Amino acid sequence: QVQLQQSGAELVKPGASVKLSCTASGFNIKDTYMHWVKQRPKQGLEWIGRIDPANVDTKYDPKFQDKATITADTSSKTTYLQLSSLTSEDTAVYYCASYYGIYWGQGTTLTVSSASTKGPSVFPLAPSSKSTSGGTAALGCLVKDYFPEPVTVSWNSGALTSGVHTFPAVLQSSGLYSLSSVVTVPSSSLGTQTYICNVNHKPSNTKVDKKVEPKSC
Amino acid sequence: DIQMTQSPSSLSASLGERVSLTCRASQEINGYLGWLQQKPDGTIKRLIYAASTLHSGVPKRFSGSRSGSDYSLTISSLESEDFADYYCLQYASYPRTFGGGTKVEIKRTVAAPSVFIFPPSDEQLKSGTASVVCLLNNFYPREAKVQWKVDNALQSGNSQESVTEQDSKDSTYSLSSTLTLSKADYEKHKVYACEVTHQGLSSPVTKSFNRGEC
Ligand SMILES: O=C(O)CCCCP(=O)([O-])Oc1ccc([N+](=O)[O-])cc1
């Protein structure tokens, strides 16, 4: 069907520039009228500006007048969002919308940081500090110091899905990410069932499997 | 620039309940107003345009109206798929402006958290850093206070919190708190505790471990 296709994720250093794209799959010049919206992590929607190619007109919010530049290629039914002199404040998801907001794109994530791609360190969150059983036990894996996100975590190669809670990552003061994945299991299974978290970080091509054993400490 | 003030910013409601969200315009916008819905996966869809006209295929349980400078979106009876984030948008003038947004979450009975504390691993101690984690499992409402205490001395500025989205099955939340210390500072103390306060607990619960590192 008729939709809006956006370009993939971008990772740049502060000071640089990026050019994102949004193509209208199966449309025309009258439909090359597009809006561009910004959304910072866990925040609201912000209107950046819009392009009306038929009247070679472009409008921006005063706050983005120096930051953004929207252009349009009527032949390919694609509009481009150019963002310059990037800072951490520009790390967000950018969306595109058609005339009257009828169709919306899937969004493009932009991450601005001086950090380099690094794989994670996986540490076990062992069940019990010395206490022998108790009813329902909890165990997990601490996925620390990786960049950029995301990272995928599964348990027992996908066999264990019940009771699993994988938390949203946090940005540490070092500029690196961290998160933990936990699972509640029966205390009676700790000495007989094997628990292993499978961590996969595609950006760095790091695949780590960590067995979580009840070391009782 | 026309400003849109959206209220409330958060709303807890039960299935089948009638709810209303409102957006006040700082200037006359003459019926030019649209309403959008954003699902937790980031998908955005237009629900209403021209203040009261529904987008093709949108459930008739959704409706829009105007009373003075206040524009409202009403859901006559809430369904499971309706628990998402909502935003109003004006297009009477340039620049186009959005309302702050409203998050609609599922209301359920009070659930106390299950608390667990995790000591750092020997593996991490080799790198010179120690992470102590406190887990709060399956609770409701979202509000919860976590306090760290080392040798019964309250900590500050050295902890990080992370909370999950509301669970599709039981409508509960889960939270983790991570205390980060240097191996040196960690090895100069004995008791590490996690004090939890929540509406479903009569008195604060405390979990601790003494000397643990494996
Ligand atoms: O003169 C008219 O009929 C209004 C033209 C405004 C077209 P526009 O695309 O710039 O503004 C809009 C953007 C989004 C929506 N929406 O309901 O999401 C509605 C209008």
Regarding whether B100 and B10 lie in a shared domain, the answer is: yes
Are B89 and B101 in contact, with CB atoms under 8 Å apart?
A: no
Q: Tell me how far apart the alpha carbons of residues A179 and A201 are, in angstroms, rounded to a whole number.
A: 13
User: Which H or E element spans position B68?
Assistant: none
A182 half-sphere exposure, CB direction, 13 A CA radius = 30
Final residue of a structural domain among B61, B82, B108: B108
* Secondary structure (3-state) at B111: strand
Residue A166's identity, in one-letter code, is T
Q: Whose CA is nearest to atom 11 of ligand 1?
A: A100
Q: Which among B87, B95, B176 is the nearest to A180, CB-wise?
A: B176
Q: Same structural domain for residues B78 and B143?
A: no
- Out of B108, B126, B146, pick the residue that ends a domain: B108
Which two structure tokens, joined as six digits, stand for A60? Answer: 């921006």
CA separation, residue A47 to residues A40, B31, B97 (Å): 12, 20, 6
CA of A30 to the centre of ligand 1 (A): 14
Q: How many CB atoms lie within 10 A of CB B126?
A: 9
**B150: β partners:** B153, B192
Instruction: Note if the bond before B204 is cis, omega within 30 degrees.
Output: no
Alpha carbon distance A205, A39 (integer Å): 28
Most A CBs within 10 Å, among B2, B38, B214, to test the A interface: B214
**Based on the structure, what is the number of domains in chain B?**
2
CB nearest A217 (choices: B117, B163, B214): B214
The residue count of chain B comes to 214
Task: Enter the tokens of residue B138.
Answer: 């399956």
The best mutation among B91, B93, B94, B98 to test binding of ligand 1, ranked by most ligand atoms within 8 Å of the C-beta, falls on B91
Helix (H, G, I), strand (E, B) or coil at B119: coil
Query: Which residue is it, tokens 């019940």?
Result: A162
The backbone region for A133, taken as left when phi is positive above 0, alpha when psi lies in -120 to 50, beta otherwise, is left
Two tokens, residue B50: 């021209």
Region label for A15, one of left (φ > 0), alpha (ψ between -120 and 50) or beta (otherwise): left
Q: What is the DSSP string of chain A?
A: --EEEE---EEE-TT--EEEEEEEET--GGG--EEEEEE-TTS-EEEEEEEEGGGTEEEE-GGGTTTEEEEEETTTTEEEEEE-S--GGG-EEEEEE-GGG--B---EEEEE-SPPPB--EEEEE-S-SS----SEEEEEEEEEEEBSS--EEEEGGGTB-TTEEEPPPEE-TTS-EEEEEEEEEEGGGTTTS--EEEEEEGGGTEEEEEE------
Closest CA to A197 of A187, A212, A185, A213: A212
Amino acid present at A97: A
Please, are residues B130 and B159 in contact by the beta-carbon 8 Å criterion?
no
Q: Please give the distance, rounded to the nearest whole angstrom, from the Cα atom of residue B89 to the centre of ligand 1.
A: 9
CA distances from A150 to A119, A167, A180, B110 (A): 11, 12, 13, 33
Distance A120 CA to ligand 1 centre (A): 45
Pairwise CA distance, residues A59 & A48, whole Å: 9
Distance CA A215, CA B112 (A): 28
Strand partners, B75: B19, B62
Same domain, B204 and B144: yes
Which has the closest alpha carbon to B71: B2, B148, B125? B2
Cα–Cα distance measured from residue A170 to residue B9, given in angstroms and rounded to the nearest whole number: 23
Q: Which domains does chain A have, with CATH numbers?
A: 1-114 (2.60.40.10), 115-214 (2.60.40.10)
DSSP string, A144-197: EEEBSS--EEEEGGGTB-TTEEEPPPEE-TTS-EEEEEEEEEEGGGTTTS--EE
Question: Measured in angstroms, how far is the CA atom of residue A96 from the centroid of ligand 1?
Answer: 13
Chain B: residue whose CA lies nearest to A210: B123
Question: Resolution, in Å, please?
Answer: 2.0
Provide, as residue numbers in chain A, all residues whose Cβ is less than 8 Å from the Cβ of B131.
123, 142, 144
* B121 lies in the same domain as B199: yes
Neighbours of A192 (CB within 10 A): 6
Q: How far off is chain B from A87, nearest CA to CA, in Å?
A: 23
In this structure, the answer to whether residues B99 and B122 fall within a common structural domain is no
Looking at the fold, whether B87 and B158 belong to one and the same domain comes out as no
For A61, A197, B96, B134, B151, the CA distances from A125, given in Å and listed in that order, are: 47, 11, 48, 10, 22
3-class secondary-structure state, position B81: helix
User: B141 and B206: one domain?
Assistant: yes
Q: How far is A109 from chain B (nearest CA, A)?
A: 11
Q: Which phi and psi angles does B23 have, rounded to 5°?
A: -135, 120
**A89 phi/psi in degrees, rounded to 5:** -70, -15
Do B34 and B102 share a structural domain?
yes
Task: Note whether B13 and B99 are same-domain residues.
Answer: yes
In 3D, which of A11, A150, A35 has the Cα closest to residue A88? A11
Q: CB–CB of B98 and A216 under 8 A?
A: no
Name the residue among B87, B163, B214 with its Cβ closest to that of A126. B214
> How many whole angstroms separate alpha carbon B170 and alpha carbon B29?
42
Nearest residue to B98 via CA among A56, A7, A36: A36
Sign of CA dihedral A35, A41, A45, A49: negative
Query: What is the domain-level CATH number for residue B4?
Result: 2.60.40.10
Q: Which DSSP category does B80 fall into? A: G
Cα–Cα dist A60/A129, whole Å:
57
- B103 and B161 in a common domain: no
Answer yes or no: do B16 and B87 share one domain.
Answer: yes
Strand partners, B195: B147, B206
Minimal-distance CA residue to ligand 1 atom 12 = A100
Question: B184: part of which helix (H) or strand (E)?
Answer: helix B183-186
CA–centroid distance, residue B11 to ligand 1 (Å): 27
Domain end: B83, B108, B133, which one? B108
Please check whether residues B88 and B185 belong to one and the same domain. no
Q: Which DSSP helix (H) or strand (E) runs through B61?
A: none
**C-alpha distances in angstroms, B128 versus B146, B173, B180, B210?**
25, 32, 11, 19
CA of A60, closest CA in chain B: separation in Å? Answer: 6
Asked if B161 and B196 touch (Cβ cutoff 8 Å), the reply is: no
Output the ligand 1 site: residues, CB below 6 A: A 50, 99-101; B 34, 36, 46, 49, 89, 91
B138/A187 Cα distance (integer angstroms): 18
What do you get for the CA distance between the two ends of chain B, in Å?
59
- Domain carrying residue B154: 109-211
SS3 B185: helix
The enclosing H or E element of B123 equals helix B122-125
Residue tagged 């009070």 (tokens) = B110
Residue (of A23, A20, A22, A17) closest to A9 by Cα position: A20
Q: Between A165, A170, A215, which is nearest B174 by CB?
A: A165
**One-letter identity of residue A33:** Y
From the CB of residue B124, how many other CB atoms can be counted at a distance below 10 Å?
18
- Rg over alpha carbons for chain A, rounded to the nearest Å, is 23
Q: State how far the Cα of B60 lies from the Cα of B64, in Å rounded to an integer.
A: 11
Would the CB atoms of A136 and B119 count as touching at under 8 Å?
Answer: no
